[PDB]
Design an enzyme around this catalytic site. Sequence first.
Site, PDB file in Angstrom:
ATOM      1  CE1 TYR A   2     -86.018 -45.135 -53.867  1.00 35.40           C
ATOM      2  CE2 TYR A   2     -87.346 -43.389 -52.933  1.00 35.40           C
ATOM      3  CZ  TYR A   2     -87.066 -44.737 -53.076  1.00 35.40           C
ATOM      4  OH  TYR A   2     -87.809 -45.719 -52.462  1.00 35.40           O
TER       5      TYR A   2
ATOM      6  CG  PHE B 257     -92.264 -39.709 -48.999  1.00 35.73           C
ATOM      7  CD1 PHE B 257     -92.139 -40.822 -49.808  1.00 35.73           C
ATOM      8  CD2 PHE B 257     -92.295 -38.456 -49.598  1.00 35.73           C
ATOM      9  CE1 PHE B 257     -92.030 -40.681 -51.184  1.00 35.73           C
ATOM     10  CE2 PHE B 257     -92.224 -38.326 -50.970  1.00 35.73           C
ATOM     11  CZ  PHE B 257     -92.088 -39.439 -51.739  1.00 35.73           C
ATOM     12  CG  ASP B 258     -88.685 -44.651 -49.190  1.00 34.90           C
ATOM     13  OD1 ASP B 258     -88.144 -45.112 -48.173  1.00 34.90           O
ATOM     14  OD2 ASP B 258     -88.919 -45.267 -50.170  1.00 34.90           O
TER      15      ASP B 258
ATOM     16  CB  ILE C 146     -95.293 -42.516 -59.686  1.00 33.36           C
ATOM     17  CG1 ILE C 146     -93.912 -41.918 -59.398  1.00 33.36           C
ATOM     18  CG2 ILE C 146     -96.022 -43.038 -58.441  1.00 33.36           C
ATOM     19  CD1 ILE C 146     -93.947 -40.713 -58.514  1.00 33.36           C
TER      20      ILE C 146
ATOM     21  CE1 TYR D 146     -97.743 -44.531 -55.369  1.00 36.21           C
ATOM     22  CE2 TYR D 146     -96.372 -42.606 -54.924  1.00 36.21           C
ATOM     23  CZ  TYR D 146     -96.503 -43.967 -55.147  1.00 36.21           C
ATOM     24  OH  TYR D 146     -95.414 -44.778 -55.181  1.00 36.21           O
TER      25      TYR D 146
ATOM     26  CG  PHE E 295     -88.928 -38.328 -56.070  1.00 26.59           C
ATOM     27  CD1 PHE E 295     -88.830 -39.412 -55.217  1.00 26.59           C
ATOM     28  CD2 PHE E 295     -90.160 -38.068 -56.631  1.00 26.59           C
ATOM     29  CE1 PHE E 295     -89.943 -40.163 -54.863  1.00 26.59           C
ATOM     30  CE2 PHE E 295     -91.271 -38.833 -56.306  1.00 26.59           C
ATOM     31  CZ  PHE E 295     -91.155 -39.896 -55.440  1.00 26.59           C
TER      32      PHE E 295
END
Length: 128
Positions: free
Chosen positions: A45, A55-56, A75, A101, A118
């Site tokens: 991902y 962010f990731d 999540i 979140y 995502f």
Amino acid sequence: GAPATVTEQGEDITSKKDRGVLKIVKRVGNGEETPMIGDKVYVHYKGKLSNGKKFDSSHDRNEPFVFSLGKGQVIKAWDIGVATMKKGEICHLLCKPEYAYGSAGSLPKIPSNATLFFEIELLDFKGE
Ligand SMILES: COC[C@H]1CN(Cc2ccccn2)C(=O)[C@@H]2CCC[C@H]1N2S(=O)(=O)c1ccc2ncsc2c1
């Protein structure tokens, strides 16, 4: 870009039909079968904030992200969205904060009340 497109053209995959999780299938996967609750799922991902920052990314780590589906290890939008995927599928998911979140965020990278984007690839799923 892709986040705008899933926002405006995505399918609501929530049971509540509250548009909290929107999905577009980007690469069609294999056959009909989707993982089941409790399966070990392997994904790649990338995640982006609504400000455009990445962010990731699991590809940046050269290893997949592994979790047990449907157990609240991720999540809610991921438990809902990965459960819809076929093996080999790539999808885009747009995740409103109630399925992510929330007001808490996740320190340090995810602000309060964050809508997340995502791209997810379902590599494999196995029952242990
Ligand atoms: C490496 O991150 C793995 C995983 C994290 N969790 C579970 C979790 C456990 C504990 C605390 C918070 N979250 C997730 O549910 C979602 C979806 C699955 C993929 C990942 N995220 S994330 O949103 O990409 C994310 C969120 C925060 C974060 N801070 C730095 S990297 C990063 C990644």
